[PDB]
Design an enzyme around this catalytic site. Structure first.
Site, PDB file in Angstrom:
ATOM      1  N   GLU A  25     -50.794  13.457   4.077  1.00 22.56           N
ATOM      2  CA  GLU A  25     -51.522  12.319   4.609  1.00 22.56           C
ATOM      3  C   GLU A  25     -51.231  11.041   3.799  1.00 22.56           C
ATOM      4  OE1 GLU A  25     -55.718  12.745   4.765  1.00 22.56           O
ATOM      5  OE2 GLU A  25     -55.958  10.906   5.963  1.00 22.56           O
ATOM      6  N   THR A  61     -58.716  13.822  11.281  1.00 25.63           N
ATOM      7  CA  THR A  61     -58.925  14.696  12.434  1.00 25.63           C
ATOM      8  C   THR A  61     -57.620  15.429  12.764  1.00 25.63           C
ATOM      9  OG1 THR A  61     -60.601  13.142  13.295  1.00 25.63           O
ATOM     10  CG2 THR A  61     -59.796  14.829  14.818  1.00 25.63           C
ATOM     11  N   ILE A  78     -56.206   2.411   8.982  1.00 22.92           N
ATOM     12  CA  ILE A  78     -57.539   2.935   8.704  1.00 22.92           C
ATOM     13  C   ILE A  78     -58.183   3.186  10.067  1.00 22.92           C
ATOM     14  CG2 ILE A  78     -59.757   2.570   7.523  1.00 22.92           C
ATOM     15  CD1 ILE A  78     -58.333   0.290   5.890  1.00 22.92           C
TER      16      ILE A  78
HETATM   17  N1  LIG Z   1     -52.489   2.484  -0.533  1.00 23.23           N
HETATM   18  C1  LIG Z   1     -53.726   2.604  -0.001  1.00 23.23           C
HETATM   19  C2  LIG Z   1     -54.110   3.756   0.686  1.00 23.23           C
HETATM   20  C3  LIG Z   1     -55.399   3.817   1.221  1.00 23.23           C
HETATM   21  N2  LIG Z   1     -56.221   2.774   1.062  1.00 23.23           N
HETATM   22  C4  LIG Z   1     -57.579   2.796   1.591  1.00 23.23           C
HETATM   23  C5  LIG Z   1     -57.618   2.668   3.106  1.00 23.23           C
HETATM   24  C6  LIG Z   1     -58.837   3.471   3.481  1.00 23.23           C
HETATM   25  O1  LIG Z   1     -59.906   2.548   3.591  1.00 23.23           O
HETATM   26  C7  LIG Z   1     -59.135   4.396   2.308  1.00 23.23           C
HETATM   27  C8  LIG Z   1     -58.931   5.863   2.642  1.00 23.23           C
HETATM   28  O2  LIG Z   1     -57.666   6.000   3.292  1.00 23.23           O
HETATM   29  O3  LIG Z   1     -58.224   4.033   1.269  1.00 23.23           O
HETATM   30  C9  LIG Z   1     -55.822   1.676   0.397  1.00 23.23           C
HETATM   31  O4  LIG Z   1     -56.661   0.620   0.250  1.00 23.23           O
HETATM   32  N3  LIG Z   1     -54.592   1.586  -0.131  1.00 23.23           N
END
Ligand SMILES: Nc1ccn([C@H]2C[C@H](O)[C@@H](CO)O2)c(=O)n1
Ligand SMILES: Nc1ccn([C@H]2C[C@H](O)[C@@H](CO)O2)c(=O)n1
Lengths: 185, 191
Positions: free
Chosen positions: B87, B18, B12
């Protein structure tokens, strides 16, 4: 590539296990898929069925999610036999058991919604083979006697009211794919 | 039938959004799949991301299950383009985010086990297209700063410790090769 598929539906205690055993002698020509209760009782040493019954507000979500998975595994399982008979389905999970858990407040909105998104994605990606439903129709009070009749640690706290709720949901779905209704009373 | 697939991984606040925006001008020839945060924020009017962050012991399980689904939808989505850039992935969900939620006690054994059975069934049924991982490697402190320098959202209170946990898990997976990837990893200094 799935053979002709029959689904056995009905309440808890509707005699599906007894009924399914009549087909055991025909195992050579029929694909017989018992409801995967043994899977649910041992998810790596975790009994999700017990946990769900003991604490539904906590465990209804993971339990039903694992039900969906195991049912999906049965629905899509490979067999060379030309007839398949399944005890329950992804449809009763969705239309009766998940719906009821939503109505009694065991599944909060967001948890129900997550389960619902999975079902949608399943139906959009996979045609689920379902040619005939045999509905073992019972009255909730007879179903209740059948559960007490058999020793099952898990279901031994289920109220008659819960069985009535599941009964009406099977009626909505199956009365109010060809459905054959049998008096399982 | 999936094109060459690149997955953008990292903590994160590692700058993935970006970085992904640099490819926006090439939308005509590349399939660009942003992390489906908008889906997670609106599951029929329910913000699972918010709920997870506010109450993880309650919401980690349904949240991660919905993550799995949406990632699977992205992985298998149809495109005629000959390059796909994603992503994140089902792999970081499994190997980092779910693993960490298990370790911190937000996912009890039975909930973790349910999520794991889904992953197994997915890998056994679907080959998931993954040709290259671009790892945007950051330090937890830098990831922390990035979060606190941008607009407030559901993330904005994640402790540095949480980011350190996620960092080590990305290192285990993408550098130590202690998770079953079998895929080329390109490491970039996103600091
Ligand atoms: N498997 C995932 C993928 C992403 N996120 C969270 C991390 C970031 O805080 C938000 C956006 O990427 O989602 C998450 O908790 N679990
Ligand atoms: N979708 C399902 C299928 C079954 N069960 C429960 C009802 C019985 O108690 C037991 C065996 O069918 O599992 C359930 O809660 N939800």
């Amino acid at each position: 590539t799935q053979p002709f598929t029959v689904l056995i539906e009905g309440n808890i205690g509707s005699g599906k296990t007894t009924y399914l055993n009549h087909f055991e002698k025909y195992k050579n020509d029929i694909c017989l898929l018992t409801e995967p209760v043994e899977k649910w009782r041992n998810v790596n040493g975790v009994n999700l069925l017990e946990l769900m019954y003991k604490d539904p507000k906590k465990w209804a979500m993971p339990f039903q999610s694992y039900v969906t998975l195991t049912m999906l595994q049965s629905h899509t399982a490979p067999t060379n036999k030309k007839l398949k008979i399944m005890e329950r389905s992804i449809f009763s999970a969705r239309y009766c058991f998940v719906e009821n858990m939503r109505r009694n407040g065991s599944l909060e909105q967001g948890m129900y919604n997550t389960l619902e998104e999975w079902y949608k994605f399943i139906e959009e990606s996979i045609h689920v083979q379902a040619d005939l439903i045999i509905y073992l129709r019972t009255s909730p009070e007879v179903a209740y006697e059948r559960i007490r009749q058999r020793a099952r640690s898990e279901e031994s706290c289920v109220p008659l009211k819960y069985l009535q709720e599941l009964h009406e949901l099977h009626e909505d779905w199956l009365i109010h794919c060809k459905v054959l209704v049998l008096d399982a009373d």
